[PDB]
Motif scaffolding. Sequence first.
Motif, PDB file in Angstrom:
ATOM      1  N   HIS A 181     -32.671  32.457  -0.495  1.00  0.00           N
ATOM      2  CA  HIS A 181     -34.025  31.936  -0.663  1.00  0.00           C
ATOM      3  C   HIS A 181     -35.066  33.064  -0.841  1.00  0.00           C
ATOM      4  N   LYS A 182     -35.932  32.920  -1.844  1.00  0.00           N
ATOM      5  CA  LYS A 182     -36.926  33.950  -2.152  1.00  0.00           C
ATOM      6  C   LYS A 182     -38.339  33.462  -1.842  1.00  0.00           C
ATOM      7  N   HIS A 194     -36.265  37.893   0.918  1.00  0.00           N
ATOM      8  CA  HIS A 194     -35.014  37.314   0.437  1.00  0.00           C
ATOM      9  C   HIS A 194     -34.181  36.886   1.622  1.00  0.00           C
ATOM     10  N   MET A 225     -29.140  31.863   2.331  1.00  0.00           N
ATOM     11  CA  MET A 225     -29.171  30.423   2.567  1.00  0.00           C
ATOM     12  C   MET A 225     -28.301  29.948   3.708  1.00  0.00           C
ATOM     13  N   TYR A 254     -36.165  28.836   7.189  1.00  0.00           N
ATOM     14  CA  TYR A 254     -37.321  29.214   6.391  1.00  0.00           C
ATOM     15  C   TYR A 254     -38.282  30.000   7.289  1.00  0.00           C
ATOM     16  N   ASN A 291     -39.408  22.818 -13.196  1.00  0.00           N
ATOM     17  CA  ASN A 291     -39.943  23.458 -11.965  1.00  0.00           C
ATOM     18  C   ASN A 291     -41.201  22.787 -11.354  1.00  0.00           C
ATOM     19  N   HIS A 320     -40.602  24.844   0.186  1.00  0.00           N
ATOM     20  CA  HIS A 320     -40.040  25.827  -0.680  1.00  0.00           C
ATOM     21  C   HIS A 320     -38.509  25.998  -0.459  1.00  0.00           C
ATOM     22  N   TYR A 321     -38.049  25.929   0.804  1.00  0.00           N
ATOM     23  CA  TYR A 321     -36.626  26.060   1.144  1.00  0.00           C
ATOM     24  C   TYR A 321     -35.923  24.862   0.506  1.00  0.00           C
ATOM     25  N   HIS A 340     -34.988  24.958  -3.134  1.00  0.00           N
ATOM     26  CA  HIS A 340     -33.891  25.858  -3.494  1.00  0.00           C
ATOM     27  C   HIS A 340     -32.531  25.474  -2.886  1.00  0.00           C
ATOM     28  N   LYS A 397     -30.885  17.880  -3.549  1.00  0.00           N
ATOM     29  CA  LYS A 397     -32.235  17.388  -3.857  1.00  0.00           C
ATOM     30  C   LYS A 397     -32.262  15.980  -4.426  1.00  0.00           C
TER      31      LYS A 397
END
Lengths: 241, 243
Positions: A4-5, A199, A202, A207, B35, B137-138, B141, B147
């Motif tokens: 995760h970024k 970074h 995962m 988070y 996105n 945000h997590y 991704h 999702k």
Amino acid sequence: ATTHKFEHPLNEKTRIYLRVESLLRQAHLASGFADNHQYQLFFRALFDMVEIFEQIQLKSELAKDLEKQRLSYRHWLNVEGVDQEALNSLLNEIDVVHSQLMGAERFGQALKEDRFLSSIRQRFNLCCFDLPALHYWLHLPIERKKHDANQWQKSLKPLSDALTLWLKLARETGHFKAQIARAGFFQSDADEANILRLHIPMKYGVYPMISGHKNRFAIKFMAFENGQACSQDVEFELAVC
Amino acid sequence: TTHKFEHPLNEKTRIYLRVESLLRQAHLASGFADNHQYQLFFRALFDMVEIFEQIQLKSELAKDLEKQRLSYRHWLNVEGVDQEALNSLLNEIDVVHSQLMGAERFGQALKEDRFLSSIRQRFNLPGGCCFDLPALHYWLHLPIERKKHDANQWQKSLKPLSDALTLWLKLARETGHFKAQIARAGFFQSDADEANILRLHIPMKYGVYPMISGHKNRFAIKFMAFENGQACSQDVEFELAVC
């Protein structure tokens, strides 16, 4: 698919930069009106940006920030070991974007002055049965819709060019280094930093919750599962720009 | 070369039309193909939760579906009416109406979702990206499969409402008939007895758009020139269906 970024602004001006970057891209992506909901993203981006231009002196902030970046590159002029052509090309890109910035109109002025936009701005913000004028506009030829959206966007070009450059050069200065948050917690300090970039593997299922005061910042890793603090040691990479 | 406008004649139909729109909006954003679709998806979900928390939508929709069911009863045993197709329509109304009355409180499952309610109030503020909302945000991704699965579970919680509303709007629109009208000097007025929706078809050629207002059982249509927002004062030909 492995990491995760995340990015975290460390001050209010950078929080505006990142927010504007996001809206500019949203309005740009939404401006083909390819799907019959994309207009919703487009107008909301436009109107969120206008709200921002009222509440901060973005043009002068961004001018000064680009001057700070120029100065860091000019210190390498004529230094034997640095590609002078690459450097000069970048310095030329800077004063072109900065010059454009300086002769630009008040940000969001042409948007505020557009009859159609203002007439819907307040109510858009509170589907189109209560905005008959927007509904009519959505029914215009796709060429026409794209033309109007492009005209509205051209007015933000000085902002877009300057911000895009500043951010690109800011991100350049960050080098990712290995860190460990023992029991989910990390803190450090940074002199003059604007953006943290993280970074995070995962596998941890976490988070970051990041906070700061003056030059210090603190990262707390929370489990996605329960929103509660993760007690595990978290190995991650951190770039400070 | 025709501009098509729909106007709700009452506050219940206002909500029906808002919900129809949010339901399609969440559905089309559900694939997370661009996105930025997640913006439309979660705004719709949360705008629905808001909408529910204010009005007896289940009760109003049930009664409306029952009224539709009554209307078909002028079709049973009629020469030349396909009774197979009729009985199927009646059964479909019944199943959708049973499902709706049997449903959990609308939006309850969304409210009880840990992740959703954790981002709900921050989400609803002035909004543009995710440095603000790291949990979101997590989530963005996670693998696309995961999702979509999460998105389909949330939408499935609304399925009894969606089926009922989609059916009632379908049948209400099919019973409205477009009749040519005329707004001499850009004004039209009539009166709608028991009507819910006005459906207007306006030639592209006039560059006008309708302002519609109402009182009791009466409504007024005033056309405006799109180019200057000013009142149009010329003869406007259009089709009007009252549903």
